[PDB]
Design a protein around this ligand. Sequence first.
Ligand SMILES: [Ca+2]
Length: 223
Amino acid sequence: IVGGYTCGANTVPYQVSLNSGYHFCGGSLINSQWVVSAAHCYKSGIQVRLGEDNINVVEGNEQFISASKSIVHPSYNSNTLNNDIMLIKLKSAASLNSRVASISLPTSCASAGTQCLISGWGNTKSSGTSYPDVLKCLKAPILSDSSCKSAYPGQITSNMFCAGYLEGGKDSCQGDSGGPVVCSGKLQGIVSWGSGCAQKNKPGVYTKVCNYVSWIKQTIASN
Ligand SMILES: [Ca+2]
């Protein structure tokens, strides 16, 4: 996250870290056994870390749970990042408490101008590299589809939206991928892509979760 703030310990209780020997992507806990992330975060041998604030220190609230299966969206296109969404099932159920809690899926798509909360452990610089150990947060509005398509001509599908600041300076970034965009207390987006981080006229692009709710519900009910 570039230009954001320190969330504060366990104030984003649905945020997870995906760990393959190191943190590599974020995700969101949607119930006690399932995490949503980005398909471009796929790898084998994922461990899901819940209840994290400082990813480099054991603080006492964490639950570390191996993934039993990963399900990438059947229409995911790694070239265009269309349908950049994946489900991860945990080998055993998480214990839900005040520090580890699920986020609701949307019944409805969010509106342009809605302020959302984006979070993660990704790079905090627009130029250069500095990774935080504690969870960072950013509030950002959803942009109109026309300003989104203007920013990334020919690259925005109906399964994507833009959120951020056309002036630049504030954005998600590498390492935030897979993480939550929460608007009005529902998961509306997944950190997906963008051109650099926090660049002028290049806002963040997010998977539009409201398009996937049927697939998520059907998949969880059969796996
Ligand atoms: Ca920790």
